[PDB]
């Protein structure tokens, strides 16, 4: 199946993914995408940070859903 | 149809709206149940800004989605 | 997380808190360490009051910020 | 809707820039703003960041020699007695906190300034 990463800056990037592919296997994709380190990304579903360990359909998420993606970074 | 609206740490609400619905309508909902003004209100799906004058078909947000809420915060 | 906590008195106190710990959890950790009920309490953040309900990441209160009570 | 930087250039060691950073549909009120950084061959990393009270905070590599400040809606980096290692692009970008402690979700971010520091 296939799922869309969106920034609020205007990336859409269109993966291929499986239901069981873990967050950390779909940040890997998106580094190889646009070059930010999975520590640096950042994944928002339904209003939740989409964790490591977890499933896709841990999430609910589906066929041509939408991944927000935001820039994490260390501060404060 | 009953949609979902939750800031990324707090609690999630339950709305009842239809896809003909502008997001100054669901705006207006969130007042009603939350108490919190739509000038101080954003929000995002599908990595989207939702603006006030488009509907949530615009957005294709459907039966069950879950909007992500921000606060809008200024000083003073 | 440590926040601060700052009276009209200029005392500061500082909290242990959880960045989605609520401002009803904060007003209670106040009382345990204070003895301040939370229906005297008022908590400021950049002049703005803080409901019980929302989270200290509601209001993008990081690590280290300090808010401001007011008693009521 | 966006960030956008500027006020970046070759610089000699030692000398100062001021680097803006104007902000479209009132983004700024996400609360917190940040400036950071990526050089080639290294990753981004933040170097000041200020919040919609006023509060900053600073990496410890620019303490003393970088201020953050804001007016409305225009970010500002002060950035005095640069040196060699400060080359990098610049980017600033506006975001929230989730639930972890001393890491900021940038929403937004712009397009970058590059800073050029020779001696």
């Known amino acids: 199946m296939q799922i869309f990463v969106k920034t609020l800056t205007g990336k859409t990037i269109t993966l291929e993914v499986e239901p069981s592919d873990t967050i950390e296997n779909v940040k890997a994709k998106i580094q190889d995408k646009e070059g930010i380190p999975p520590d640096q990304q950042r994944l928002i579903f339904a209003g939740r940070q989409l964790e490591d360990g977890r499933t896709l359909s841990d999430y609910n998420i589906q066929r041509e859903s939408t991944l927000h993606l935001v820039l994490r970074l260390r501060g404060g | 149809m009953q949609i979902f609206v939750k800031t990324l740490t707090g609690k999630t609400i339950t709305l009842e709206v239809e896809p003909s619905d502008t997001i100054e309508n669901v705006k207006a909902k969130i007042q009603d149940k939350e108490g919190i003004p739509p000038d101080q209100q954003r929000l995002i799906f599908a990595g989207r800004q939702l603006e006030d004058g488009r509907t949530l078909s615009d957005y294709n947000i459907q039966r069950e989605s879950t909007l992500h809420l921000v606060l809008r915060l200024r000083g003073g | 997380m440590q926040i601060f906590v700052k009276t009209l008195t200029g005392k500061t106190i500082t909290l242990e808190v959880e960045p989605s710990d609520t401002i009803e959890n904060v007003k209670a950790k106040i009382q345990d360490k204070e003895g301040i009920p939370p229906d005297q309490q008022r908590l400021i953040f950049a002049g703005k009051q803080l409901e019980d309900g929302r989270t200290l990441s509601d209001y993008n209160i990081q690590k280290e910020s300090t808010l401001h009570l007011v008693l009521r | 809707v966006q960030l956008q930087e500027s006020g970046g250039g070759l610089v000699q060691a030692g000398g100062s820039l001021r680097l803006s950073c104007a902000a479209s549909?009132?983004?700024?009120?996400?609360?917190?703003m940040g400036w950071y950084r990526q050089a080639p061959g290294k990753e981004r990393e933040q170097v000041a960041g200020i919040d919609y009270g006023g509060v900053t905070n600073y990496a410890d590599s620019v303490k003393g020699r970088f201020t953050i400040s804001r007016d409305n809606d225009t970010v500002y980096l002060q950035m005095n007695s640069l040196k060699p290692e400060d080359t990098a692009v610049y980017y600033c970008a506006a975001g929230i906190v989730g639930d972890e402690v001393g890491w900021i979700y940038y929403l937004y971010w712009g397009q970058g300034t590059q800073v050029t520091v020779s001696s």
């Open positions: 549909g009132s983004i700024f009120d996400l609360g917190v």
